[PDB]
Design a protein around this ligand. Structure first.
Ligand SMILES: NC(=O)c1ccc[n+]([C@@H]2O[C@H](COP(=O)([O-])OP(=O)(O)OC[C@H]3O[C@@H](n4cnc5c(N)ncnc54)[C@H](O)[C@@H]3O)[C@@H](O)[C@H]2O)c1
Ligand SMILES: NC(=O)c1ccc[n+]([C@@H]2O[C@H](COP(=O)([O-])OP(=O)(O)OC[C@H]3O[C@@H](n4cnc5c(N)ncnc54)[C@H](O)[C@@H]3O)[C@@H](O)[C@H]2O)c1
Ligand SMILES: O=c1ccn([C@@H]2O[C@H](COP(=O)(O)OP(=O)(O)Oc3ccccc3)[C@@H](O)[C@H]2O)c(=O)[nH]1
Ligand SMILES: O=c1ccn([C@@H]2O[C@H](COP(=O)(O)OP(=O)(O)Oc3ccccc3)[C@@H](O)[C@H]2O)c(=O)[nH]1
Ligand code: NA
Lengths: 338, 338
C-alpha cells in the first residue's frame, strides 16, 4: 500500500515507517520538523531497507495535503503529526487546538478532496478522562480530559466519528496510545526530545548519560503500592507493529475502529527506574518532588480487543524497553545530529 | 467602544448592531454573506442612527481578521458568525467544524495577534446535552451534544475557556442562547431564512403569509402538557439588548462569564401557534408529524444569573414576539431584496 505518514520523522512515526518499509509498503513521510530532524531520514531508510519519500510540510496546509495525496496516489493515511506536551498545552492552548484539531481537520478535508478514505489516528488514553474503572476498555464512555492536549485528542475522535457517519465508506482507526517507550534494537533510532524531557523514560535516560542531575519523581503519596504513579508502558516497536497490522487489516473496512494499544499492565515510576538502573549497570538519580499537575495515580490498558480483532499484542518486556532505550541513549548521548 | 461584530448581517447580529449603534458605539461588521444579504446593511444604519463599517470576508481568514482588528483599532469582539442548521450539520460535519471550531480559532488567534482581549461568543443551550434537570443552570455540568452543530459549540466553549486560563487578562462571555424569535418593531428587520426554514417561528410566519401550506408540529406524544415540544422563546430585541449590556459591562473584566440568555419560562409548539394566530388574525394552518430526530421534549433557561449579575432580563412578551414577526413577515413577505 501507498501510505502517507504525517509526523513520520517523529518518535513513533519513524519507527512505524521502518516497519512499513520492511513490509514492502510505499511510504511517503510528511513532516514539518517542528519536533524532529531530517537526520533521521537516512536511518529510517537504512533500517526500513527501502526508501521512503520525504516531504517537508504542515498538516495545516490543506492544498499541499491535497497535492500530496493525489500526486503520490495515496491509499491510506497514518496521522501521527501534532503537538504532544501536556504542560505546554496548558500554557499554549491555541497552538494545541490549531495543530491538533485544525491540523487534523485540514488533512481529512484534503483526503476528501483527493478521495482517500482509509485513516489511522494517533489517539490517547487521555480520552478516558478521570476513569475510575481500570483497566480502560474501549467500550467505556469517554471522560473529560484535563488538559488542552487531552481535549484536542477527544475532539478529533468525535470529529472523525461524525465524519465517518456522513461518509460511511471510510475506514477510520482510533488507536489509543498509553505510554510508548523504548527504541529500535539497532540503538540507532530512538526518542529525541528537545530541552528538558517531559516524559519519564527520556528523563531517566538523560540522567544516566549525564544530561541531567537527578530524576524528579512527581509525588510519592499516591494510592499505589509504592506511592508513585502507575502506567502501561509499551515498546515503540510493538506500537509500530500494531500500526502496520491495523493499516493492513483495516484498510477498506468501513467503520470507526477503536483500540487501546498497550501492554495491559501497570508499572510504577520506581519500577521503571529499577529497570533502567538495571539496564545501565548503575543506579539512577532521583529525588521526590511534588505531584505533577493533572497526573492521575494509576491506569493501564485493556488491550484484549486488539488481540482478538487484530491478532496483535505486545512482545517486548519492560526490561527490553529499558535496555533498548539505554542502547540508543548511550550510542547517541545528544540524539540525532543537526 | 469599537466593536467587531462577526455575522453582523445575520438575524441576531443585525438586531444587535442596531442596538449598539443606538448606544453610540463604533461598529464594524464582518460577514461572508453566506446566509445574509447586503440589503440589510442600509436598514441597520437607518434603524441604528449611525453608519456601521462593513467588511465582506470570512472568519476563517486569519490574516484578514488580523488586519481588521488592527487597522480598525477594535477593542471588543461579538462573534455571531457560523453555521447553525442542525440537520445539515449531521450530513456535513466537516464544514461545521471548520466554520465553527476553526473559524472561531482563527478569529481568536487574530485577536491575540492584534492584542484584542474582549470577546462575546454566541453559545447554545445544546451544550447542556440531555439534561433531565429543568430549567438549565449555568452551574450544571455540560453534556454531550448530539449533532456536529452542538458539539462545535461546546468545543468552542472549552477552547475559549482554556485560552482564558492561559491568558487570564481576557474577558470571555459564553452567552448560551435558547430560541431567538421576533423582529425589530419597525417590521423593517427580522429573520430571513433561505429555502425551507428549520425553525418554528419562521415556518409559522411563512404559513401565515401564504408561503407554506401547513405547519408540521413534530410529535404530539411528548411528555408535555400538550404533548408538543416545550422551549424557551426569547425576543431577538431582548437578546440584542443583552449583548449590548454584556459587552458594556464585561469589557476589561477578566474571566469566563457564562450566562444563559433566555426568558426563563417554557412554551409549547401549540402555545406559539396560538400566539401567532391571534397576532395574525387568522387561525394558523397546522398538522401533526412524527417526532423530529434529536428533539428534546422540553427545556428552558434559568436566567437569574444574568438578572443578578448583569441586571438584565427580558422585557418583551410572547405575543410581542409573534406580533413583531408577523409585522416583518407581512411587510417583507419575500424578506430582504436581492
Ligand atoms: N498517551 C498519549 O497521549 C500518546 C502518547 C504519546 C504519543 N501520542 C501521539 O502520537 C503522535 C506522535 O507522537 P510522537 O511521540 O512520535 O511525537 P513526535 O513529536 O516525536 O512526533 C510528531 C511529529 O509530528 C511533527 N509535527 C507536529 N506538528 C505538525 C504539523 N502541523 N505539521 C506537520 N508535522 C507536524 C513533529 O515535527 C514530529 O516529527 C502524536 O499525535 C502524539 O500526540 C499519543
Ligand atoms: N439555540 C442555539 O444554539 C442558538 C440559537 C440561535 C442562534 N445561535 C447562534 O447565534 C449565531 C447567530 O445566529 P443567527 O440566527 O443570527 O444566524 P445567521 O445565519 O443569521 O447569522 C450568522 C451570520 O454569519 C455569517 N457567516 C457564517 N459563517 C461565516 C463565516 N465563516 N465567516 C463569516 N461570516 C459567516 C452568515 O452569513 C450570517 O450572516 C450563530 O453562531 C448561531 O449558531 C445559537
Ligand atoms: O520527569 C518525570 C516525568 C514523569 N514522571 C511520572 O512518570 C509517569 C509517566 O509520566 P509521563 O509524563 O512520562 O507520561 P504520561 O503518563 O503523562 O502519558 C503521556 C505520554 C505522552 C504524551 C501525553 C501523555 C507519571 O506518573 C509521571 O508523574 C516523573 O515522575 N518524572
Ligand atoms: O417546523 C417546525 C420547527 C420546529 N418545530 C418544533 O418547534 C420546537 C422548536 O424547534 P426549533 O427548530 O425552532 O428550535 P430548537 O428548539 O431546536 O432550537 C435550536 C435553534 C437554533 C439552533 C439550534 C437549535 C421544537 O419542539 C420542534 O420540534 C416544529 O414542530 N415545527
Ligand atoms: Na499559563
Amino acid at each position: 500500500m501507498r501510505v502517507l505518514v504525517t509526523g513520520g520523522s517523529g518518535y513513533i512515526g519513524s519507527h512505524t515507517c521502518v516497519q512499513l518499509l520492511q513490509n514492502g509498503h510505499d511510504v511517503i513521510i510528511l513532516d514539518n520538523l517542528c519536533n524532529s530532524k531530517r537526520s533521521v531520514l537516512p536511518v529510517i531508510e537504512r533500517l526500513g531497507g527501502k526508501h521512503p519519500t520525504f516531504v517537508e510540510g504542515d498538516i495545516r496546509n490543506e492544498a499541499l495535503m491535497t497535492e500530496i495525496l493525489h500526486d503520490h496516489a495515496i491509499d491510506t493515511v497514518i496521522h501521527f503529526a501534532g503537538l504532544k506536551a501536556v504542560g505546554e498545552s496548558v500554557q499554549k492552548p491555541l497552538e494545541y487546538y490549531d495543530n491538533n484539531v485544525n491540523g487534523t481537520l485540514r488533512l481529512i478535508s484534503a483526503m476528501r478532496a483527493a478521495n482517500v478514505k482509509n485513516f489511522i489516528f494517533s489517539s490517547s488514553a487521555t480520552v478516558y478522562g478521570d476513569q475510575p474503572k481500570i483497566p480502560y476498555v474501549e467500550s467505556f464512555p469517554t471522560g473529560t480530559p484535563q488538559s488542552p492536549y487531552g481535549k484536542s485528542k477527544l475532539m478529533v475522535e468525535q470529529i472523525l466519528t461524525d465524519l465517518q457517519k456522513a461518509q460511511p465508506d471510510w475506514s477510520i482507526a482510533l488507536l489509543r496510545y498509553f505510554n510508548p517507550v523504548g527504541a529500535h534494537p539497532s540503538g540507532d533510532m530512538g526518542e529525541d526530545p528537545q530541552g528538558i524531557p517531559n516524559n519519564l523514560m527520556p528523563y531517566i535516560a538523560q540522567v544516566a548519560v549525564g544530561r541531567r542531575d537527578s530524576l524528579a519523581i512527581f509525588g510519592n503519596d499516591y494510592p499505589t503500592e509504592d506511592g508513585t504513579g502507575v502506567r502501561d508502558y509499551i515498546h515503540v516497536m510493538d506500537l509500530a507493529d500494531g500500526h502496520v497490522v491495523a493499516m493492513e487489516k483495516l484498510a477498506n473496512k468501513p467503520g470507526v475502529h477503536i483500540y487501546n494499544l498497550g501492554a495491559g499492565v501497570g508499572n510504577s515510576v520506581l519500577d521503571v527506574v529499577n529497570a533502567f538502573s538495571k539496564a545501565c549497570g548503575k543506579p539512577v538519580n532521583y529525588h521526590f518532588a511534588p505531584r505533577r499537575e493533572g497526573d492521575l495515580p494509576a491506569y493501564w490498558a485493556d488491550a484484549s480487543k486488539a488481540d482478538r480483532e487484530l491478532n496483535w499484542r505486545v512482545t517486548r518486556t519492560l526490561d527490553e524497553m529499558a535496555q533498548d532505550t539505554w542502547h540508543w541513549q548511550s550510542r547517541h548521548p545528544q540524539g540525532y545530529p543537526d
